[PDB]
Design a protein around this ligand. Structure first.
Ligand SMILES: *[C@@H]1O[C@H](CO)[C@@H](O[C@@H]2O[C@H](CO)[C@@H](O[C@@H]3O[C@H](CO)[C@@H](O)[C@H](O)[C@@H]3O)[C@H](O)[C@H]2NC(C)=O)[C@H](O)[C@H]1NC(C)=O
Ligand SMILES: CCC[C@@H](CCO)Nc1nc(N)nc2c3ccccc3n(Cc3cc(CN[C@H]4CCOC4)ccc3OC)c12
Ligand SMILES: CCC[C@@H](CCO)Nc1nc(N)nc2c3ccccc3n(Cc3cc(CN[C@H]4CCOC4)ccc3OC)c12
Ligand SMILES: *[C@@H]1O[C@H](CO)[C@@H](O[C@@H]2O[C@H](CO)[C@@H](O)[C@H](O)[C@H]2NC(C)=O)[C@H](O)[C@H]1NC(C)=O
Ligand SMILES: *[C@@H]1O[C@H](CO)[C@@H](O[C@@H]2O[C@H](CO)[C@@H](O)[C@H](O)[C@H]2NC(C)=O)[C@H](O)[C@H]1NC(C)=O
Ligand SMILES: *[C@@H]1O[C@H](CO)[C@@H](O[C@@H]2O[C@H](CO)[C@@H](O)[C@H](O)[C@H]2NC(C)=O)[C@H](O)[C@H]1NC(C)=O
Ligand SMILES: *[C@@H]1O[C@H](CO)[C@@H](O)[C@H](O)[C@H]1NC(C)=O
Ligand SMILES: *[C@@H]1O[C@H](CO)[C@@H](O)[C@H](O)[C@H]1NC(C)=O
Ligand SMILES: *[C@@H]1O[C@H](CO)[C@@H](O)[C@H](O)[C@H]1NC(C)=O
Ligand SMILES: *[C@@H]1O[C@H](CO)[C@@H](O)[C@H](O)[C@H]1NC(C)=O
Ligand SMILES: *[C@@H]1O[C@H](CO)[C@@H](O)[C@H](O)[C@H]1NC(C)=O
Ligand SMILES: *[C@@H]1O[C@H](CO)[C@@H](O)[C@H](O)[C@H]1NC(C)=O
Ligand SMILES: *[C@@H]1O[C@H](CO)[C@@H](O)[C@H](O)[C@H]1NC(C)=O
Ligand SMILES: *[C@@H]1O[C@H](CO)[C@@H](O)[C@H](O)[C@H]1NC(C)=O
Ligand SMILES: *[C@@H]1O[C@H](CO)[C@@H](O)[C@H](O)[C@H]1NC(C)=O
Ligand SMILES: *[C@@H]1O[C@H](CO)[C@@H](O)[C@H](O)[C@H]1NC(C)=O
Ligand SMILES: *[C@@H]1O[C@H](CO)[C@@H](O)[C@H](O)[C@H]1NC(C)=O
Ligand SMILES: *[C@@H]1O[C@H](CO)[C@@H](O)[C@H](O)[C@H]1NC(C)=O
Ligand SMILES: *[C@@H]1O[C@H](CO)[C@@H](O)[C@H](O)[C@H]1NC(C)=O
Ligand SMILES: *[C@@H]1O[C@H](CO)[C@@H](O)[C@H](O)[C@H]1NC(C)=O
Ligand SMILES: [Cl-]
Ligand SMILES: [Cl-]
Lengths: 768, 768
């Protein structure tokens, strides 16, 4: 019961520990900075709005501002929306920030600014101007930035935001920025490394530019540099999903052998997409502490067989040599140099896109004595032959990725993977054979791999009847992903040999369930004694030879995308207890099952400890709410995206346990006279995207509403007459979390109030 | 134009040739028979309504009625809707039909009637009472039906509508119906064949009942019977998707060897699901003209190897022996008796569910000299081995169906396939290998099958790179369905060996298009010189090594369910001419491509003779209508299911050629002041399911409206104030076809008029 309503259209959060007062106006369709922002405000965000200008009046009384995030108010035409394009660039009038003597961070990204904003305070430490039209850096313009530490100037001249000229940087422009630790000139059409840079730099990003050559003294003084990224300079353009111009004559980024000599503190070096053909060992003579090295998207296929530079990298943790194939050569085998054995500290090795026919156990011998190896990733290689038992010498590894290959009996290709916008590994040893050509499996295929905890066979061609003899060696397996295959449940003994299996995914195995007259045994769960979660989604199951699935251990069953409307056809009582004998089942998802109505017997036939039930996306035109009494342990009920028109006359007389009721996206036009009356256990209600016009005090008593952790009411049809005087008042003074209060809890009428937010409504005329 | 607006909520059609005045009120949410039904009404339909009763007042002035279809006004609870269930059964008061001396057909199905309606006219020829609660037929109740010819009484006692007792029929109940040609007692829980039946019967349906035995004289006088159906009497219940009780001891329907002796005119005999183990030749001794014989769902696996009864069936056109497998036996081969060679007139032979491992050429030798054979269907048999070249001896056949099998290098199971409710074969010789386990193809697999005109490999495991050497023998192929496979377009020479190919379906081959960095050649079309239609739907295509698809012959390209939003990413002009060089393309479907906006260059890059363009289901939030000038041959533009808010200022200025414009399911709230001014080519406009409130005279000129073949306006937000005086008058007096005028062209306001149809609106108060 607030004494003064919050009318501001922004989320205000108070952080007493750090003396901070955060005001978040992200995406609030604002044409001006809202009035009445708290005076003690420290963090102000106005991202994704259409405020045309900033002036001294903008932050006149907000003298305690430490951060102003004013991003994407005039986002460039090719990056922003087309339905609501920006007419004119952001206008920053003089002395707009000079008064803010406490300002530490200022983001003015995506505003089509032509020049670096002047008159900034001396307390500024972070300045961000990405996605603007600033493509000429002059020493005089950066004079004001004396105490700056982080400076982002990238994305000011690239294919999604062209400047039509080369990027210009004056000589020694950043040299007097004596506190500059991070500098980013990425995606800018830069032709040379700007010099001289301040020696205090720790991170330098110059990727996706027109730098054809590095001079031997471009980084002669950066003795504190930790991260250096020179990627996408002379790019490898084969199959680039963005406009890509390589250097003439297919030449690489020319780097002198002594260019990195002063970088004794370098930890990360990224040379991705530089068309490199050789990696000279001399580069790493003085770089002893190098931890991460990205050499993906180059022409280093032959170099992988020699790789003498690896002898100078004993502290390297991550090595990426992906997509280095020779454009027209399908190699017979992978040639890994014996130098890979000198990478004592290596944890992650990725060599996707090498492209070779057969993997043999000996080819991986340089990796045998790398005690800290955790990930070996050989995905996207078109490997047709590989004895899976070879991985018995890699029991220590956490993940062995052979995804996207041909074995049988967006990351490397995106332009900027760090572009700013406005799983079973936890179980243990994982062998990923997903998206491969395995059509038949037998126990011998998994010999010597008893240690595996997860096996992902998702997306293979497995059209087979499993009888409990295909995975006999996998005695420790806890997770099997068998999705996107053609499983034939002819026998109820399928998967029984995997005695320690906790999670089984057989989703998207619809093939045999689509043809009539075929036997399906869904009672195979009885034999899996420690199974916790079974997913059998999108199988199109409309028939079953067995009438009951049984299990003493299963806690979650996902059965979405099936045809329970056909199994539970009215007049056919045979499958009404299909899930009843899953005695420890707590979560059942039967959404997307075309259940227009739930026959009588579905609720009585549910397992006894059912906590979360989803009936979403079913086209449910009716629901006997009284039947919820059978589900004595129900905590969450999800009836979203259906065609329900009414709520229960008394929710208390339906379920004593129900905590979370989700009714979003239905046709409810009114709540019953005493809906939540005496339903004190309810802690979450969603009635958003319905067609409710009125909500009275009897249907929504305050003794229940105040207990709610959250209440969603947005996108309804609220009629704002004097009869809604209670709803409008309570919404304005409630402490209960109602998301979208000031942006989507709107009046549809009458006349004057059409489109008006209920939070800003003044019904004083109703009381005179 | 019309002087008197049509206010009746039913479709009135006049057929001057056959002199009928048809009034169709199907599904019009009527609680009473509407007033003002024309006095000349001959055919009146009131199906799917909630009219609680019929009385003499119902058809008082409609003395010329020839047909009354009053079905499903109180449909049984298990068959009907649950959101709006029927409270009480239909009440027919006395003398309701006695006055209608011209009544020929009366349908009172699905009304929960307890007894046969009495007081019917002597002119009635067809009476239908299916899905009611009439399960006791007495001779006295049928005396009024003296001149009846067709009588449907089925579905009055089965699992979806139980009566809890056996069906009773009095002795000689139908005997005095001396004109009865069709009698149907299907799905009724009947225990014996009713006798004596009138000899004038031509069709008798007694399927899905509890008839355990036929007496030798049950059909002793039906010398004019043409169709006899005794299916589902002692049913085969293995994998029945409905409640199925077989006869005790697994015994069949007992039919004496001489039971069909009097049936010299029998053309169709259906013995589906009768658990038959033998078919005695003696049954067909006196049946010489039998044309159709259904023996599916029996236990005739061993009988198929002997089948001596086939020697008495030389005039049989259709033979069905599907789903006769021995429950626990997977046979090594199919044993077809040599007696099949005596079926001289056979055109269709279906033997699905026989279940056998190998198909050998000599096993089909009884079929070699059957000159009229057109269809051989061996689907759902789990055949693992079959030399496709064996079909060289079946060039005369139209369809060879081997769908749903394991070959590698609802119809038979529904309860009542005739239950009433309230393709490449045209190209020539078709070989259907769909839903099989073929993972690799080579030219030798199609040797000796050069005659094939269609080959359906849909839903196989083909993960391969085609280079133009896999289908070398198929020189006459006009249609290849390759959908639901894993095609790898590494080479642009894919499919080029099929030189006479006119239609190619490579839809749902998304596997290789989903992983990054893989080469895809979409320019393979250039080599196919007579290709007319290419479907490459739902492939998730977001990248392509080739920038242009070329073709001198392609007329239709379906590219829905792909990612043209990524290929045409703003700033990337490389794929804007992807479809430009398809010089003879007339229809392009680029719906479901996530195109929120169309970049500049898409319209200019379209082929020159593009006539039909679909951009439906894209989430298009904006559209530069002026760009339609580039599409000089445009005739149909489909922009349905998008987020467009405005129509062009003057459509005629955007496109001189456009004829059909579909804008259904958008956010259009108003039409521009001169929207259709001078749009002389427009013949079809769809503005339904939008949010339009007002339409003025200037937006809809009479010279353009009178040329429209159809105009859709339903499901809008029409405000019915005095400002809508033009639109309300125009809708009432126009002759233009506007569908759903009395069920969905409604007023949303103001107040009083909420929910009212605009056709029934009286705005006389606007002019005083
Ligand atoms: C087709 O006709 C048969 C009879 O020929 C109907 O079966 C009969 O159904 C009733 C009601 O379900 C059964 O009676 C009940 O039996 C139980 C168990 O003894 C008892 O607790 C009830 O109070 C009641 O007496 C009756 O036994 C049963 N008869 C036979 C021979 O099965 C059948 O329902 C009809 N089919 C349909 C679809 O209506
Ligand atoms: C219309 C399909 C009918 C079903 C019936 C199964 O209950 N068959 C099948 N239903 C499914 N879901 N899959 C398959 C299947 C997959 C591969 C090969 C043949 C296959 N059959 C054929 C079949 C097999 C057997 C196996 N026998 C061995 C078991 C241990 O010792 C003997 C017995 C009777 C059979 O049909 C009569 C079926
Ligand atoms: C990251 C994958 C990159 C692409 C590159 C294609 O330009 N490869 C592939 N792209 C697709 N879409 N599929 C396959 C593929 C399928 C099965 C086996 C290997 C496969 N490769 C591998 C490859 C093959 C060749 C075969 N050449 C013979 C053809 C006739 O004479 C020479 C040449 C270079 C190759 O990569 C270097 C690819
Ligand atoms: C409010 O502004 C301050 C200053 O810009 C933000 O402080 C940064 O917080 C992160 C941790 O989240 C630290 O790693 C940085 O070093 C801090 N920067 C500075 C300059 O102190 C703070 O996160 C902002 N709070 C919100 C909620 O926006
Ligand atoms: C990067 O700079 C180059 C020039 O160094 C820009 O290329 C020029 O673009 C104009 C306008 O299209 C042409 O008239 C010139 O001929 C181009 N010069 C050269 C040498 O190519 C290029 O547009 C810039 N990149 C971006 C994304 O703006
Ligand atoms: C109007 O009623 C007549 C009589 O019930 C219908 O006539 C049937 O027409 C079909 C098709 O021409 C014939 O096969 C039937 O034999 C006719 N039945 C009788 C009893 O004559 C006619 O179809 C009805 N028209 C409509 C549109 O409902
Ligand atoms: C491996 O590749 C190197 C060149 O990179 C070559 O010198 C060497 O002979 C190759 N060895 C094998 C076994 O392929
Ligand atoms: C696979 O490798 C194991 C040894 O790791 C060996 O015992 C087995 O025979 C091999 N199988 C094949 C087919 O090479
Ligand atoms: C298996 O791999 C697929 C991708 O091929 C991935 O979507 C899925 O999440 C993986 N399974 C698990 C359990 O991580
Ligand atoms: C399972 O099938 C394999 C062959 O695929 C066979 O060796 C084994 O005996 C079968 N299991 C049982 C229990 O019959
Ligand atoms: C599944 O049901 C079938 C009968 O329908 C039975 O033979 C089989 O033993 C059942 N499976 C289990 C694990 O109980
Ligand atoms: C679903 O059940 C799990 C426990 O099995 C629980 O943690 C989770 O909160 C439930 N879902 C919801 C939405 O409450
Ligand atoms: C609770 O609901 C049931 C069913 O709707 C009803 O019969 C009963 O009277 C209700 N309880 C009270 C106290 O009204
Ligand atoms: C075919 O089946 C019949 C029985 O139906 C049997 O008499 C005959 O020997 C069988 N012949 C072959 C070749 O299998
Ligand atoms: C398939 O049958 C043809 C004869 O029609 C024969 O020439 C060919 O060798 C057979 N192929 C196989 C694999 O047996
Ligand atoms: C191929 O078979 C599938 C069913 O397996 C069917 O949907 C499709 O229409 C068939 N193709 C043609 C061209 O008829
Ligand atoms: C196509 O593949 C076949 C089988 O591998 C091969 O013999 C043939 O040479 C290939 N075609 C071309 C043009 O290389
Ligand atoms: C398809 O494009 C590639 C280059 O991307 C070219 O080599 C090939 O010849 C093209 N194919 C045709 C049929 O034009
Ligand atoms: C026009 O093309 C559409 C596809 O965009 C097609 O569905 C429609 O039937 C075509 N109509 C005519 C008259 O050609
Ligand atoms: C569009 O309208 C203007 C004004 O009448 C006219 O000058 C222009 O030629 C028109 N364009 C087309 C394509 O009809
Ligand atoms: Cl079993
Ligand atoms: Cl090629």
């Amino acid at each position: 019961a607030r004494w003064f309503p919050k009318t501001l259209p922004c989320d205000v959060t108070l952080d007493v520990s750090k003396n901070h007062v955060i005001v978040d106006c992200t995406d609030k369709h604002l044409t001006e900075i809202p009035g009445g922002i708290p005076t003690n405000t420290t963090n102000l965000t106005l991202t994704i709005n259409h405020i045309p200008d900033i002036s001294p009046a903008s932050f006149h009384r907000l003298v305690h501002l430490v951060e102003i995030d004013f991003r994407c108010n005039c986002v460039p035409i090719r990056l922003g929306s087309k339905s609501n394009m920006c007419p004119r660039r952001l206008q920053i009038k003089p002395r707009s920030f000079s008064g803010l003597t406490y300002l530490k961070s200022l983001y003015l990204d995506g505003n089509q600014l032509l020049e670096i904003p002047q008159g900034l305070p001396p307390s500024l430490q972070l300045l961000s101007l990405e996605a603007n039209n600033i493509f000429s850096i002059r020493k005089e313009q950066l004079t004001e930035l004396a105490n700056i530490e982080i400076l982002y100037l990238g994305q000011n001249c690239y294919y999604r935001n062209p400047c039509y000229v080369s990027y210009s940087i004056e000589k020694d422009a950043f040299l007097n920025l004596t506190k500059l630790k991070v500098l980013s000139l990425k995606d800018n059409n830069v032709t040379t490394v700007p010099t001289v840079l301040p020696s205090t730099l720790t991170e330098l990003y110059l990727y996706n530019n027109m730098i054809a050559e590095i001079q031997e003294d471009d980084f002669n003084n950066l003795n504190q540099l930790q991260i250096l990224d020179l990627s996408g300079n002379c790019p490898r353009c084969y199959n680039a999903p963005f406009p890509c111009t390589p250097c003439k004559n297919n030449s690489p980024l020319q780097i002198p052998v002594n260019a990195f000599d002063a970088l004794t503190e370098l930890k990360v070096l990224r040379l991705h997409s530089n068309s490199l053909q050789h990696v000279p060992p001399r580069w790493f003579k003085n770089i002893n502490n190098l931890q991460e090295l990205d050499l993906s998207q180059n022409f280093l296929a032959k170099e992988i067989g020699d790789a003498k530079f690896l002898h100078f990298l004993p502290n390297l943790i991550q090595l990426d040599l992906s997509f280095n194939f020779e454009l027209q050569v399908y190699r017979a085998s992978m040639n890994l140099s014996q130098a890979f054995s000198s990478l004592k500290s290596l944890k992650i090795l990725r060599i996707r896109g090498y492209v070779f026919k057969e993997l043999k156990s000996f080819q991986l011998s340089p990796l045998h004595n790398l005690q800290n190896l955790e990930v070996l990733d050989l995905g996207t290689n078109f490997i047709k032959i590989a004895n899976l038992s070879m991985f018995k010498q890699f029991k220590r590894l956490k993940v062995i990725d052979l995804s996207v290959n041909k074995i049988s009996p967006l990351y490397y290709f995106r332009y900027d993977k760090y572009a700013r916008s406005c799983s079973c590994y936890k179980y243990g040893q994982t062998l990923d054979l997903s998206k491969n050509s395995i059509f038949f499996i037998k126990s011998s295929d998994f010999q010597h791999l008893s240690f595996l905890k997860c096996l992902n066979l998702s997306g293979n061609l497995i059209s087979q009847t499993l009888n409990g003899s295909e995975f006999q060696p996998l005695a420790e397996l806890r997770y099997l992903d068998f999705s996107n295959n053609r499983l034939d449940l002819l026998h109820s003994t399928a998967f029984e040999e995997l005695r320690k299996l906790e999670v089984l995914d057989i989703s998207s195995n619809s093939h045999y369930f689509q043809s009539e007259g075929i036997t399906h045994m869904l009672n195979f769960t009885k034999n899996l004694k420690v199974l916790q979660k079974l997913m059998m989604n999108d199988n199109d199951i409309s028939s079953s030879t067995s009438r009951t699935m049984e299990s003493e251990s299963l806690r979650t069953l996902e059965f979405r995308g099936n045809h329970l409307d056909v199994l539970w056809r009215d007049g056919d009582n045979r499958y009404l207890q299909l899930f009843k004998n899953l005695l420890k089942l707590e979560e059942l998802d039967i959404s997307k099952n075309s259940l227009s109505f739930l026959p009588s017997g579905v609720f009585d036939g549910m397992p006894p400890n059912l906590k979360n039930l989803s009936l979403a996306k079913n086209g449910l035109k009716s629901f006997i709410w009284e039947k919820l009494r059978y589900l004595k342990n129900l905590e969450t009920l999800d009836l979203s995206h259906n065609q329900l028109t009414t709520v229960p006359e008394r929710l208390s007389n339906c379920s004593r346990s129900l905590k979370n009721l989700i009714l979003k996206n239905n046709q409810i036009r009114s709540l019953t006279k005493y809906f939540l009356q005496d339903a004190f256990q309810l802690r979450y209600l969603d009635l958003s995207s319905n067609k409710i016009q009125m909500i009275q005090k009897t249907s929504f008593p305050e003794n229940v509403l105040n207990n709610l952790k959250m209440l969603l009411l947005h996108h309804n049809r609220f009629l704002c007459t004097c009869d809604a005087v209670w709803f409008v008042w309570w919404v304005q003074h409630t402490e209960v979390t109602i998301p979208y209060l000031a942006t989507d809890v709107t009046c549809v009428g009458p006349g004057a109030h059409k489109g008006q937010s209920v939070i800003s409504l003044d019904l004083y005329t109703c009381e005179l």
